[PDB]
Amino acid sequence: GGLDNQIQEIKESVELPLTHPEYYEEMGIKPPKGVILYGPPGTGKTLLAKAVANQTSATFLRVVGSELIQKYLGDGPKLVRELFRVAEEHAPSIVFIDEIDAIGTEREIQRTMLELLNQLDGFDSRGDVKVIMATNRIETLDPALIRPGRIDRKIEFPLPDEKTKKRIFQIHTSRTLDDLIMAKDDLSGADIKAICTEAGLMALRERRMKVTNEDFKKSKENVLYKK
């Protein structure tokens, strides 16, 4: 809600390959770099909702975090080369990487991430697949990732904490604002879609959609106490 310009700009951004073939093969752009995203809220659903436009008509691939690397001996970039060869044999796909927080949870991360940086640039392969990287804090990445990695476009997602919460909260009350624009510290599409989906199914349960402030603070207390 409200982030329509950024989602249509990232829509046109991620909708160049596999679509509009009359100019993609005649002009000759073919960028083998992809985009790199991030967000202070994160939670995977905002960035997954920004890069989710590729999932309409395509084959999706998801690799979240380097946890599968740190849970084993120093194998290093061999699994990255396995994803590179299976991505070469599976060119019509999208390489989506999310939650790059290896330091937010040391010298080896810099060298396997430097090898991932060099191999990610496509020094030995032309335009074959799109690579999308996503993290939470942009300050956690090393400065070596600036020139090779971020070459196409980066997004500046602002955290208002008093505008988007008022918009979405106004959408919920459309069917006492400082308590929820001040108490909450993170939002995404899965919250409005979650409590609105189960709110519609519950409205199918009791056949009325009346929402009282005490029942809404109880349903909020369920999610607050759940975490």
Q: Detail the residues annotated as belonging to a binding site.
A: 39-46
If binding means CB under 8 A, how many residues of this protein chain bind another protein? 8
Q: Does 170 bind another protein (CB under 8 A)?
A: no
Return d(Cα 190, Cα 46) in angstroms, integer: 9
Interface residue with another protein among 8, 19, 110, 140 (CB under 8 A) is 19
Shortest reach from residue 139's CB to another protein, in Å: 37
Return d(Cα 168, Cα 160) in angstroms, integer: 12
Structure tokens at 95: 């390489």
Binding residues for ATP: 39-46
The span of 16-24, 115-123, 163-171, 190-198 binding another protein (CB under 8 A) equals 16-24
From residue 10, how far is each of 57, 91, 128, 130 by CA, in Å? 16, 21, 20, 14
Residue 190 region by backbone torsions, left for phi larger than 0, else alpha for psi between -120 and 50, else beta: alpha
43-74 b/e (C-beta count within 10 Å ≥ 16 → b):
bbbbbbbbbbbbeeebeebeeebbeebeeeee
Interface residue with another protein among 4, 5, 22, 156 (CB under 8 A) is 22
Q: Does 52 bind another protein (CB under 8 A)?
A: no
For another protein, give the closer residue by CB, 5 or 57.
Answer: 57
Q: Does 57 bind another protein (CB under 8 A)?
A: yes
Q: Does 21 bind another protein (CB under 8 A)?
A: yes
Chain residues binding another protein by CB under 8 A are 18-19, 21-22, 56-58, 92
